[PDB]
Each structure stands twice: as structure tokens, then as C-alpha cells.
Design an enzyme around this catalytic site. Structure first.
Site, short mmCIF file in Angstrom:
data_model
loop_
_atom_site.label_atom_id
_atom_site.label_comp_id
_atom_site.label_asym_id
_atom_site.label_seq_id
_atom_site.Cartn_x
_atom_site.Cartn_y
_atom_site.Cartn_z
N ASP A 180 0.62 -1.61 0.41
CA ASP A 180 -0.02 0.03 0.17
C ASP A 180 1.16 0.96 0.07
OD1 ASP A 180 -2.09 -1.39 0.22
OD2 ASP A 180 -1.85 -1.57 1.86
N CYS A 214 -2.79 0.16 -13.84
CA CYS A 214 -2.54 0.15 -12.45
C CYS A 214 -4.37 1.10 -12.10
CB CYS A 214 -1.85 0.53 -11.69
SG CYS A 214 -0.58 1.67 -12.55
N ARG A 220 3.30 1.90 -11.03
CA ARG A 220 3.02 0.67 -10.75
C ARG A 220 2.88 0.22 -12.57
NH1 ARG A 220 -1.31 -1.59 -6.36
NH2 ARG A 220 -0.30 0.07 -5.13
N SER A 221 2.06 0.66 -13.54
CA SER A 221 2.00 -0.40 -15.24
C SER A 221 3.58 0.68 -16.18
CB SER A 221 0.92 1.25 -16.19
OG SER A 221 -0.83 -0.50 -15.07
N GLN A 261 6.22 6.68 -11.46
CA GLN A 261 5.39 8.29 -10.74
C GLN A 261 6.58 8.76 -9.85
OE1 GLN A 261 1.97 6.58 -9.65
NE2 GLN A 261 0.80 8.11 -10.67
#
Length: 280
Positions: A180, A214, A220-221, A261
Site C-alpha cells: 500500500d 494500475c 506501477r504500469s 511516478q
């Protein structure tokens, strides 16, 4: 020797400085279709939009917009569709894109509920007995089977076009082990997830591009595609040391903004390529 570049950035702690240079050199192309007031409710975040030149166009005549981008890595000979997690009102748009782009695999890199918040909509069936119908489309979705493992889940899905009665098998690769907060301390499970996607044949060019998503479709992608492309390059190049993760990422950012990111995801991408290359 990419390991050497990793040790020197780690020693000086310059991961934030490196990442900030990538953001400064990243391409900036217009996103006018996404910013139309008609498509506001089709975007999960107002600051994450596809470029006009690379956005996936729905074959719908009235409104062809979906927050999705086509990433073409010519030297690596691979193509990806990066999109956001479907919204409650864009689940039919999502599967229409999968059908129209002739995709075989769908890669999901987030859980539906992460830290008590909805990051994505339930766009696939939870029970095999109940099918999902998308009214605005001609599509019927049925869960055939699923194989649940500790780090990821693989589901077999059947996508049926109610018009022509044509059915396709869709493989759904759901990675569920992403923390998370932050990134995985080790890329072992993430790499095993990637190689599992590779072994299914979903990335092969005789199929449409895989759909990777994502929450926003950049974080994450980006790590999944960046790692997959960098591993392909050093396997087919005479000198594997010529592969620059930063160069490959900047080339990728020409097709969708904001891939990777955080500086933490950039460090994780380095670790995945390094371990993946050692694993060959």
C-alpha cells in the site's frame, strides 16, 4: 555494469535527482481530446491524460475517448496499451477497447481496495456462475476459471460479442502483492509475475497489445513495461551494457505522460532489470 550505475546512485543517494532530471527531459505533447468537458467523467484524475497522437480510439462513432495510450517500443519489438483502472461508467469502454484492439492479455497491478479506498472498479466477474453484461456495448463477460497464488492471480475469461456470437479467451493477470505504501523490497515476485505473463504468449505480436493498468496507468504500469522492455533489449543486443534505463524510460514517455511516478519506483525498476538480467 548497470549494477555499477546502481551502486553509485545508491552510494550518493541521488535517486531523487536522477528522477527529477527524467521529469525535466520528458516529452510534452497536447492532450486536447482528454481535456474536452465531454470527457471529464471518463478521467479518474485531471492531471493524468493520454496524448492525442497516441491515445487509443474507440470504434464508437459519437465519443471515441478512453484514457488509454498505445506504447510502441520498436527496437524491443513490443507494444502495450496503458490505461487507468476502469471507472464505474467506463467498464464497457474498457472491454470494447480490448475487443477492438484484439488484446489477449490484461495485466492488473493493483487491488480493488487498497488501504480502505477504491482504486479501481470491479470490471470482471467474481463468480463463475454469474456473467457480466455491458449495456452500452455488445459484449458479454464470463469467468471461466482462476488460479489464486500468494503474489498474483491468473483468471481465464471469455469475451463474447453478442452481435456475431464470436468469443475470445482473455487471460487476466492480477498482481496483488504491491504494498500500500512504497515499493516491494524485493523484485522477486514482480519478476516471476512478468515471466508468467511472457510464458502465456500474450505479449506476442500476433495478438493485439496487452492492456496494462494500475490506478492511473502510469505508476506501477510504467514499471511493468519498462522492466519488460529493458530485459528484451539486453537479450537481443550484442552489448547488453548499452541499455540505459533512463533512455528507455524517456522513449516510453513519448507515448504516455508520467510513466514511473516516484523516485522509489525508478529505483525498483533498476532492481527488477538487474535481477531479471541475472535470472536471464
Amino acid at each position: 555494469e548497470m549494477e555499477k550505475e546502481f551502486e553509485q546512485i545508491d552510494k550518493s543517494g541521488s535517486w531523487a535527482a536522477i528522477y527529477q532530471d527524467i521529469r525535466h527531459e520528458a516529452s510534452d505533447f497536447p492532450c486536447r481530446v482528454a481535456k474536452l468537458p465531454k470527457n471529464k467523467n471518463r478521467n479518474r484524475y485531471r492531471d493524468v491524460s493520454p496524448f492525442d497522437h497516441s491515445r487509443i480510439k474507440l470504434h464508437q462513432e459519437d465519443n471515441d475517448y478512453i484514457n488509454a495510450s498505445l506504447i510502441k517500443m520498436e527496437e524491443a519489438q513490443r507494444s502495450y496499451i496503458l490505461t487507468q483502472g476502469p471507472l464505474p461508467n467506463t467498464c464497457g469502454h474498457f472491454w470494447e477497447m480490448v475487443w477492438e484492439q484484439k488484446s489477449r492479455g490484461v495485466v492488473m497491478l493493483n487491488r480493488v481496495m487498497e488501504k480502505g479506498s477504491l482504486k479501481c472498479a470491479q470490471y470482471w466477474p467474481q463468480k463463475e456462475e454469474k456473467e457480466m453484461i455491458f449495456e452500452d456495448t455488445n459484449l458479454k463477460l464470463t469467468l471461466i476459471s482462476e488460479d489464486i497464488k500468494s503474489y498474483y492471480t491468473v483468471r481465464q475469461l471469455e469475451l463474447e460479442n453478442l452481435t456475431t456470437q464470436e468469443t475470445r479467451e482473455i487471460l487476466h493477470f492480477h498482481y496483488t502483492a504491491w504494498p500500500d505504501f512504497g515499493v516491494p523490497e524485493s523484485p522477486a515476485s514482480f519478476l516471476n509475475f512478468l515471466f508468467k505473463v511472457r510464458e502465456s504468449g500474450s505479449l506476442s505480436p500476433e495478438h493485439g497489445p496487452v492492456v496494462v493498468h494500475c490506478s492511473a496507468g502510469i505508476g506501477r504500469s510504467g514499471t511493468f513495461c519498462l522492466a519488460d522492455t529493458c530485459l528484451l533489449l539486453m537479450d537481443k543486443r550484442k552489448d547488453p551494457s548499452s541499455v540505459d534505463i533512463k533512455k528507455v524510460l524517456l522513449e516510453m514517455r513519448k507515448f504516455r505522460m508520467g510513466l514511473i511516478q516516484t523516485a522509489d519506483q525508478l529505483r525498483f525498476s533498476y532492481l527488477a532489470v538487474i535481477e531479471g538480467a541475472k535470472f536471464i
